[PDB]
Amino acid sequence: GLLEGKRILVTGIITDSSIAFHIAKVAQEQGAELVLTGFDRLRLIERITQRLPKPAPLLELDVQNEEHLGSLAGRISEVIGEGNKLDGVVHSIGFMPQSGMGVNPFFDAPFADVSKGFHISAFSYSSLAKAVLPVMNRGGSIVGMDFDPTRAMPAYNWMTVAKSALESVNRFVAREAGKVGVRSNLVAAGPIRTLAMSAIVGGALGDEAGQQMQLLEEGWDQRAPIGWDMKDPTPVAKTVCALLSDWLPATTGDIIFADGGAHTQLL
Amino acid sequence: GLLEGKRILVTGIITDSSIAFHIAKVAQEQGAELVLTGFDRLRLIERITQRLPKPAPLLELDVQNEEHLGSLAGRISEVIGEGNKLDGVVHSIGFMPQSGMGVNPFFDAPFADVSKGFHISAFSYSSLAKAVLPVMNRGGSIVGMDFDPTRAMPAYNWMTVAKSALESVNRFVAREAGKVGVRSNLVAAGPIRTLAMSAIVALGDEAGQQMQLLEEGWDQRAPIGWDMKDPTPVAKTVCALLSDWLPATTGDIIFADGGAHTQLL
Amino acid sequence: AGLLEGKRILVTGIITDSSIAFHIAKVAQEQGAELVLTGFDRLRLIERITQRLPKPAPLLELDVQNEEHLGSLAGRISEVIGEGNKLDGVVHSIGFMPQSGMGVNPFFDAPFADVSKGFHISAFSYSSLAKAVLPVMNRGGSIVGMDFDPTRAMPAYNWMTVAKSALESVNRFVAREAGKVGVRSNLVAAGPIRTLAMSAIVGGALGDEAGQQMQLLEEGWDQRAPIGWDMKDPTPVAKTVCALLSDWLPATTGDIIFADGGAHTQLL
Amino acid sequence: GLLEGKRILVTGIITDSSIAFHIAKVAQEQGAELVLTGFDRLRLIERITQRLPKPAPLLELDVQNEEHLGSLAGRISEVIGEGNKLDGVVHSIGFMPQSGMGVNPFFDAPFADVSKGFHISAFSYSSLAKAVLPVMNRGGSIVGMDFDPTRAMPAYNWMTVAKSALESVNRFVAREAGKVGVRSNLVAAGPIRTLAMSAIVGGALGDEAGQQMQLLEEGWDQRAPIGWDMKDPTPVAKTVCALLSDWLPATTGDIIFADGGAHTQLL
Numbered sequence A, D: 001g002l003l004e005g006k007r008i009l010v011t012g013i014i015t016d017s018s019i020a021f022h023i024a025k026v027a028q029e030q031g032a033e034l035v036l037t038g039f040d041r042l043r044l045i046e047r048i049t050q051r052l053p054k055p056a057p058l059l060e061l062d063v064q065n066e067e068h069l070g071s072l073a074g075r076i077s078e079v080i081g082e083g084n085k086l087d088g089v090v091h092s093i094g095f096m097p098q099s100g101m102g103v104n105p106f107f108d109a110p111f112a113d114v115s116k117g118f119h120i121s122a123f124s125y126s127s128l129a130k131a132v133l134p135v136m137n138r139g140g141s142i143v144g145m146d147f148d149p150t151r152a153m154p155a156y157n158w159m160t161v162a163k164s165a166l167e168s169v170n171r172f173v174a175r176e177a178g179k180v181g182v183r184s185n186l187v188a189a190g191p192i193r194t195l196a197m198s199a200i201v202g203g204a205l206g207d208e209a210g211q212q213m214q215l216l217e218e219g220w221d222q223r224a225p226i227g228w229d230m231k232d233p234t235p236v237a238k239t240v241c242a243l244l245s246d247w248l249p250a251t252t253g254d255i256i257f258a259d260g261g262a263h264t265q266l267l
Numbered sequence B: 001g002l003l004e005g006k007r008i009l010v011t012g013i014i015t016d017s018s019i020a021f022h023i024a025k026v027a028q029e030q031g032a033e034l035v036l037t038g039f040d041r042l043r044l045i046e047r048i049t050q051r052l053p054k055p056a057p058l059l060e061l062d063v064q065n066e067e068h069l070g071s072l073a074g075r076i077s078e079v080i081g082e083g084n085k086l087d088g089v090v091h092s093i094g095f096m097p098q099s100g101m102g103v104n105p106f107f108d109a110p111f112a113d114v115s116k117g118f119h120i121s122a123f124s125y126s127s128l129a130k131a132v133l134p135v136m137n138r139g140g141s142i143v144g145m146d147f148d149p150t151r152a153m154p155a156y157n158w159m160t161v162a163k164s165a166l167e168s169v170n171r172f173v174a175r176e177a178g179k180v181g182v183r184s185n186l187v188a189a190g191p192i193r194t195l196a197m198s199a200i201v202a203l204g205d206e207a208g209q210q211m212q213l214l215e216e217g218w219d220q221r222a223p224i225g226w227d228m229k230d231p232t233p234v235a236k237t238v239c240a241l242l243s244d245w246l247p248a249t250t251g252d253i254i255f256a257d258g259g260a261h262t263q264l265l
Numbered sequence C: 001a002g003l004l005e006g007k008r009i010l011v012t013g014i015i016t017d018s019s020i021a022f023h024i025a026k027v028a029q030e031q032g033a034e035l036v037l038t039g040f041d042r043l044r045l046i047e048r049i050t051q052r053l054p055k056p057a058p059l060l061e062l063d064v065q066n067e068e069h070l071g072s073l074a075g076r077i078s079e080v081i082g083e084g085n086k087l088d089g090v091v092h093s094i095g096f097m098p099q100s101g102m103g104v105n106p107f108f109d110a111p112f113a114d115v116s117k118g119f120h121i122s123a124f125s126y127s128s129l130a131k132a133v134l135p136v137m138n139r140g141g142s143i144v145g146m147d148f149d150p151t152r153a154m155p156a157y158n159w160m161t162v163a164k165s166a167l168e169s170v171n172r173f174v175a176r177e178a179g180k181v182g183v184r185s186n187l188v189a190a191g192p193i194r195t196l197a198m199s200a201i202v203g204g205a206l207g208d209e210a211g212q213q214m215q216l217l218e219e220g221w222d223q224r225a226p227i228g229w230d231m232k233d234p235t236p237v238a239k240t241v242c243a244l245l246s247d248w249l250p251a252t253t254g255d256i257i258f259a260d261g262g263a264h265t266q267l268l
């Protein structure tokens, strides 16, 4: 297996459409031993994670909760064994209140909403790394999920701003993680049908949300030289597992695109 | 003059070393009529702005204060005249608590501090645009100050993250401002000796060595050199973007850094 | 009162009154600059075009593939501008890629000799022109070239896009050399400006599928641009070039300034 | 193995320091069956390829030679078997005449020299793809070697221009290759001590250029959060093998950095 014998923490499962669910699934198929975290809906997440190929312990983690973060490393050590450390950590956590996305006016998002979105979507990448690095092996790998924010675009609005901040945070986490021999990278994915993608069509009434998703998928698949399927998270999941493996050992502070090549083409 | 007859709002003057002070100075030399804003120490700012070439009214604006923002357009109209609008707006506002910069470890910056820095340095570019666009002419220009955050740097830490956010905010502000014929752009300046940039740093030998190497390297990398004690080239570049001479540039970043960012060594 | 008052500026690249260089020259003269112009090959026709400019200007022959033309250019410039005078600005507005490299053949089928010629004219010659003119440029001068954003692949533009990527790299090295004598070097990345060659593709020169793609590509600029984009109006591009020729961007070099309506900053 | 059962063409071996030699070594260790090509010094390359873990046929290929390119597919088919195709192709080919490098003035490099370097280092990435795509399986992978040309550098001079052109070529190759389900990507490596740059490193293209190359290497390891070892091509070879594998299946037209993270850091 690609990740045989590696112990990996996977955040961000909420439904079995979640990108983290497919990251966790491929990682287990490739021999990894997982620890999972879940936010808020722990009973529902526990049932969801039973659909994964192999059993894995589930820990509660709200990245806005400094008590959760401060106890996380010790809670991880309790489940993986006294003398054991993590080899990989997956950040697959994002949120932006409704006012910050969809057809809602960009100028009308109140700061309290945008700040919450920045906290969960960008600041928390530093928060999670700070919490887990003490229980990470040298040679380890932290990977976060990104959506290319180089250019502005409709509907993504303030979540785009949060991703721009996340990219910057990743470069600084790589400085800290490198002091202990750990890599830090983002995977910039093309669009995937998840709960997150439903936030993007927020405000659309009627068949508008469906047709907006149709236009998004059509244009992405068109630009991508090898095509793009928003219903298939497996290629993104594999890319994350590639970064969690030992096969990109000189890549850190970086962004690896898993978008079908769409961002390299203009029409 | 380059800005003859243009009415321009300039935020961010705190001393005569402020970048906004030199922007305001050059803009007046080039025929512009200015309105200034000031945060917190208004009595001191009023006296400092008397050093500018020409008089300009001063309005209070704390960009975290929604009442200040919501009244700003009406307060601008009171000073420039009933039937008049602004042609330009300069955002030269930046702040990050000490926990988010310097020798303070990146991981130890509390969220409340970083959020305040994000508010003042990135979110407020949108807030300011929202407030002034109703009293801006078509063909107008909004310019903000940037420091290239494409790569991580020691000591700048969370201020670099805020600048990464600011670049993204500018691209979305350009979409809103473009609806009314207004451009929005950032000037990415090389390092300048100001109060805000001195906050980034006295604080031990590691911080001292980091900044010397940053400054040493910037003049070295820049093909035409870089003078950290001279804000004039940055001020002129902002005036270039306020003028009518870059009329098809918006949502963009213009570098006034000696060309340093184009060179590796 | 002119943006370029008293400045002596060399403008290459005029072939018709649609040439971007023609509009650069027009605005620069309107802003008080004194121009020297260059033209390639059929100078008698180019001279009739340059008579349409607001003010008279000498025209010098320059084939940028001809090293004798390049080696004699500085002296020929000095002869027309006066013994003790130098240039303040230079505009490179020169580009060409043979048809095989811009869609008439598939990308893989363009012969190297054609592509090499396009690279020579469109990228290498920015270095060649800088070498030739820098001896007669004042400190504080400015060299500006024309770019078409090559960050992403596009239909039909093919090897010309490769040439522009090369030109962007050349500009960064010219900035190193020019900076030694106090001269800035920059590119203006313009949005598309209507031409006969690309109009032919939109007319169905490369078939109906390629025609639709080129038109969609062009239309997309005005759509993406937050302030719109007018493919028939080179004046905003001309003004931006004059802005880089002025003294108002004095700390910008090795760089790329976009005059594209903001299109490249937007994804839809 | 990461490349088990895959047939891969590797260009660019000249000595056992070549990046291509280490790509070949790791690929064979990971189960790949290789075909190798060599330019000009075929007796030397034959001996060099005997140092690899496993035997591999060696084919002559001068990428400036259109006859070599036009016969290449058939010569590949002859050695891999009638009904078999390639799964991967590695372009590890670069050259710029001395006039285009070192202390030799950038403005003085004659066009004939720069055009030759452009042909070998950038155009031939398209030429090789054109030549090999007819004998490539769907789902295959083409990988070329890049040196980040986003910013100008001492001594690399016109080779940096060639790399900027190569990055553009890669995006158009990805378009064409994507039509038949093949990916095309570059690996931007940190500096590695190889034959091509040895004279510049040794001061033979000026004492100043030698000094600047040392400063470049020192700063590269300094910037890199996980360090950079200019004598160790293994992390680069592994990254190329990662792109040849099935684990980055949604990445094309792209550039993957194997540089210690140096390019993401300013000091």
Ligand SMILES: NC(=O)c1ccc[n+]([C@@H]2O[C@H](COP(=O)([O-])OP(=O)(O)OC[C@H]3O[C@@H](n4cnc5c(N)ncnc54)[C@H](O)[C@@H]3O)[C@@H](O)[C@H]2O)c1
Pocket (backbone or CB within 6 Å): A011, A012, A013, A014, A015, A017, A018, A019, A020, A038, A039, A061, A062, A063, A064, A091, A092, A093, A094, A095, A120, A145, A146, A147, A188, A189, A190, A191, A192, A193, A194, A195, A196, A197
């Ligand atoms: N779906 C796409 O098109 C897309 C594209 C690129 C990147 N991404 C990114 O991938 C990541 C995963 O999103 P997804 O598409 O799988 O959607 P998702 O809704 O399934 O996952 C988002 C996760 O964030 C968690 N989360 C929210 N607030 C949290 C908090 N306070 N503490 C801890 N966890 C919290 C949620 O519980 C959920 O598990 C996000 O960063 C998203 O922005 C998504």
Ligand SMILES: NC(=O)c1ccc[n+]([C@@H]2O[C@H](COP(=O)([O-])OP(=O)(O)OC[C@H]3O[C@@H](n4cnc5c(N)ncnc54)[C@H](O)[C@@H]3O)[C@@H](O)[C@H]2O)c1
Pocket (backbone or CB within 6 Å): B011, B012, B013, B014, B015, B017, B018, B019, B020, B038, B039, B061, B062, B063, B064, B091, B092, B093, B094, B095, B120, B145, B146, B147, B188, B189, B190, B191, B192, B193, B194, B195, B196, B197
């Ligand atoms: N100094 C540099 O090296 C450098 C480089 C590039 C860009 N910049 C940017 O230029 C801008 C101006 O900074 P400077 O270097 O002139 O420093 P400065 O300290 O002189 O100016 C910063 C200004 O921000 C104002 N400000 C802070 N909090 C505010 C609030 N709540 N509401 C309104 N205004 C508030 C201050 O009153 C001050 O006038 C900032 O955006 C800074 O990030 C600075």
Ligand SMILES: NC(=O)c1ccc[n+]([C@@H]2O[C@H](COP(=O)([O-])OP(=O)(O)OC[C@H]3O[C@@H](n4cnc5c(N)ncnc54)[C@H](O)[C@@H]3O)[C@@H](O)[C@H]2O)c1
Pocket (backbone or CB within 6 Å): C012, C013, C014, C015, C016, C018, C019, C020, C021, C039, C040, C062, C063, C064, C065, C092, C093, C094, C095, C096, C121, C146, C147, C148, C189, C190, C191, C192, C193, C194, C195
């Ligand atoms: N038209 C657009 O959409 C567009 C967009 C962006 C950039 N540009 C660039 O702007 C520049 C000007 O192009 P244009 O649109 O005005 O087209 P154009 O055909 O009018 O100008 C190209 C010029 O190059 C000259 N030239 C060609 N070979 C030469 C040689 N051997 N020696 C000297 N001069 C030579 C031609 O005589 C002509 O004057 C080019 O670099 C072009 O790539 C054009």
Ligand SMILES: NC(=O)c1ccc[n+]([C@@H]2O[C@H](COP(=O)([O-])OP(=O)(O)OC[C@H]3O[C@@H](n4cnc5c(N)ncnc54)[C@H](O)[C@@H]3O)[C@@H](O)[C@H]2O)c1
Pocket (backbone or CB within 6 Å): D011, D012, D013, D014, D015, D017, D018, D019, D020, D038, D039, D061, D062, D063, D064, D091, D092, D093, D094, D095, D120, D145, D146, D147, D188, D189, D190, D191, D192, D193, D194, D195, D196, D197
């Ligand atoms: N060494 C580094 O620091 C570095 C960094 C990044 C990328 N790269 C790139 O990696 C690739 C491999 O170079 P290297 O450093 O391993 O050096 P090398 O000297 O070991 O390999 C260069 C190869 O190019 C081949 N080549 C030259 N002309 C050719 C032609 N006409 N036809 C076919 N092959 C030809 C040579 O035979 C040789 O095998 C090059 O593209 C180089 O630019 C190298």
Ligand code: NA
Pocket (backbone or CB within 6 Å): A221, A222, A223, A224, A225, A226, A227, A228
């Ligand atoms: Na496609």
Ligand code: NA
Pocket (backbone or CB within 6 Å): B219, B220, B221, B222, B223, B224, B225, B226
């Ligand atoms: Na310098």
Ligand code: NA
Pocket (backbone or CB within 6 Å): C221, C222, C223, C224, C225, C226, C227, C228, C229
């Ligand atoms: Na538009």
Ligand code: NA
Pocket (backbone or CB within 6 Å): D221, D222, D223, D224, D225, D226, D227, D228
């Ligand atoms: Na280091």
